[PDB]
């Protein structure tokens, strides 16, 4: 598991109902959270979007400031 460095982009195989190139953490949170295969197949983007939001909600810090519109 060593030598050549590469980047892999996450994918979702609609026929097999499974994400591909999923980083270890994400794969772990997914099966333990009980997000079913059918739900994943139903809206894979949302599932990835929610995984993102989740693991980002560990970085940003509590210090909240005013938020404005566009």
């Amino acid at each position: 598991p060593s030598d050549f460095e590469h980047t892999i982009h996450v994918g979702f195989d609609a026929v097999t109902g499974e994400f591909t190139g999923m980083p270890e953490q994400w794969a772990r949170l997914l099966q333990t959270s009980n997000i079913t295969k059918s739900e994943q197949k139903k809206n894979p983007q949302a599932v990835l979007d929610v995984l993102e939001f989740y693991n980002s909600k560990k970085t940003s810090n509590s210090q909240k400031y005013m938020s404005f519109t566009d």
């Binding site: 949170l29 997914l30 333990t32 959270s33 009980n34 997000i35 739900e39 139903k42 809206n43 949302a46 599932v47 979007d49 929610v50 995984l51 993102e52 939001f53 989740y54 909600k57 210090q63 909240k64 400031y65 005013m66 938020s67 404005f68 519109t69 566009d70």
Partner: protein, 285 residues
């Protein structure tokens, strides 16, 4: 512009010795945001909250200055307002209103609110949101922990910025477009309000018995949570909850529009909350 920031403040900070203008100081908490005290305005009797900031040794500051510039020119009875600011030595003092009493949170868990009571606080919250929005402000954290209740039953919205942070789990209140990292607007507060209304009637948060990720997933796809007994609620209330919890952002009701909603007309007097607030303050500590 570490010297320019100190110049801008001078054009905003007010004159006077806060140590003279306020009395009966009382240390409430202390942290990275500075030291906070509750106090009273000697002349008017107005009870306040004073945040004494480390200044020089504190992160980004012209954002804090930006809030001051925004809130000092706008006031509303339904939000913790900015009163004054001072410069005492190497520090910055920000004075905000301080409402005594408790949190809607404590009132939700220890007692049982009715549709009349729920409708009353929703109107007050809607007024605050309509006001904050017209000022290009997105709260983003509308929930039972951020609405203050005076023993009066009066209602104030807090924690919508740095200056108005709470003086002293899962995103259950966040909208679908937020939990899915989409571009969002003011209406995410309408969504949060719906969730809050739901919490009040249930006397409990949305996704308590659910894993975090799954809850986020449910919010992103199902939208509104499940009520233990949807039938009990009335038609005007459910209709209200539906205008608030519509996933299609633009079909979702806005604050202004929602003021005109029939559900509010059924509102009881805020004074109707006094015994609930009182009863709630007995337990928790």
């Amino acid at each position: 512009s570490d010297e320019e920031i100190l110049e801008k403040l001078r054009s905003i900070v007010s004159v006077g010795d806060p140590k003279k203008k306020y009395t009966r100081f009382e240390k409430i908490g202390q942290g990275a945001s500075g030291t906070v005290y509750t106090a009273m305005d000697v002349a008017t009797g107005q009870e306040v909250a004073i945040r004494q900031m480390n200044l020089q040794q504190q992160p980004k500051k012209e954002l804090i200055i930006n809030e001051i510039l925004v809130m000092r020119e706008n006031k509303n009875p339904n939000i913790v307002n900015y009163l004054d600011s001072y410069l005492v030595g190497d520090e910055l003092w920000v004075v905000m209103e301080y409402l005594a009493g408790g949190s809607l949170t404590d009132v939700v868990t220890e007692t049982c609110m009715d549709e009349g009571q729920i409708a009353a606080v929703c109107r007050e919250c809607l007024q605050a949101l309509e006001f904050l929005h017209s000022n290009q402000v997105i709260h983003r954290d509308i929930k039972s922990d951020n609405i203050l209740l005076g023993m009066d039953g009066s209602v104030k919205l807090t924690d919508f910025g740095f200056c108005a942070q709470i003086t002293p789990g899962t995103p259950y209140w966040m909208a679908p477009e937020v939990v899915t990292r989409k571009a969002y607007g003011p209406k995410v507060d309408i969504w949060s309000l719906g969730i809050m209304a739901i919490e009040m009637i249930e006397g409990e948060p949305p996704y308590l018995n659910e894993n975090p990720l799954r809850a986020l997933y449910l919010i992103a796809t199902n939208g509104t949570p499940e009520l233990q007994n949807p039938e009990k609620l009335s038609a005007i209330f459910r209709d209200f909850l539906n205008r608030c919890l519509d996933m299609d952002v633009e079909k979702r009701g806005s604050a202004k529009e929602l003021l005109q909603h029939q559900f509010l007309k059924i509102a009881k007097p805020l004074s109707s909350l006094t015994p609930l607030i009182a009863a709630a303050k007995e337990a928790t500590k």
